Amino acid sequence: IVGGYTCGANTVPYQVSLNSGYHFCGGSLINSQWVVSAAHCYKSGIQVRLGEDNINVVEGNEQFISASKSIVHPSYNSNTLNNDIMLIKLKSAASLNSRVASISLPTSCASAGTQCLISGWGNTKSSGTSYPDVLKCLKAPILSDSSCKSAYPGQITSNMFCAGYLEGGKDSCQGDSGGPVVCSGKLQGIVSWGSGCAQKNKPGVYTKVCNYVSWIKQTIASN
Numbered sequence: 001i002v003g004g005y006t007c008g009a010n011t012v013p014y015q016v017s018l019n020s021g022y023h024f025c026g027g028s029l030i031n032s033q034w035v036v037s038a039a040h041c042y043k044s045g046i047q048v049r050l051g052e053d054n055i056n057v058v059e060g061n062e063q064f065i066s067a068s069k070s071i072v073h074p075s076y077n078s079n080t081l082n083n084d085i086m087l088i089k090l091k092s093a094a095s096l097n098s099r100v101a102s103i104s105l106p107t108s109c110a111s112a113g114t115q116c117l118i119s120g121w122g123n124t125k126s127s128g129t130s131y132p133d134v135l136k137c138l139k140a141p142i143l144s145d146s147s148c149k150s151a152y153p154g155q156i157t158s159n160m161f162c163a164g165y166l167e168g169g170k171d172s173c174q175g176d177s178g179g180p181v182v183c184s185g186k187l188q189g190i191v192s193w194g195s196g197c198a199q200k201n202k203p204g205v206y207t208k209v210c211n212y213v214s215w216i217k218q219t220i221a222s223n
């Protein structure tokens with residue numbers, strides 16, 4: 001997250017870190033057994049880390065639970081990142097509590113102009129590299145479809161939306177991928193892609209979770 005703020009420990013209790021020996025992506029806990037993340041975060045051998053604030057210190061509220069199954073969307077296209085969504089099943093259910101909690105799936109799609117909370121342990125620099133240990137947060141508005149398409153001509157599908165600031169300075173970034181975009185208390189987006197981070201005219205692009213709720217509900221009813 002570039003141009004964000006330190007969230008505060010466990011203030012984003014649905015945020016997970018995906019670990020394969022190291023943090024590599026975020027995700028969102030949607031019930032005690034299942035995480036939503038980006039399909040481009042697929043790796044074999046994932047451990048889900050819940051209750052994290054500093055990902056490099058065991059502070060006492062974590063739950064570390066191996067994935068048993070990962071399910072990339074059936075129409076995921078890794079070239080365009082259309083349908084950039086994955087489900088991860090945990091080997092055992094998380095213990096839900098004040099620090100480890102699920103986020104609701106949406107009923108309606110969020111509106112242009114709505115301010116959403118984006119979070120993660122990704123890079124904090126637009127130019128260069130610095131990865132934080134503690135979770136970072138950013139409030140960013142959803143941009144109009146027209147503005148999104150103008151920013152990325154020929155690249156935005158109806159399963160994507162842009163959020164952020166066209167002047168630059170504030171965005172998600174590498175290492176935030178797969179994490180949550182929460183608007184009106186529901187999971188509306190997944191950190192997916194963007195040209196660089198926090199560059200002028202190149203806002204973040206996010207998977208439009210409201211298009212996937214029926215797939216998510218039938219898949220978790222079946223696995």
Ligand SMILES: [Ca+2]
Binds near residue numbers: 054055
């Ligand atoms: Ca920790």
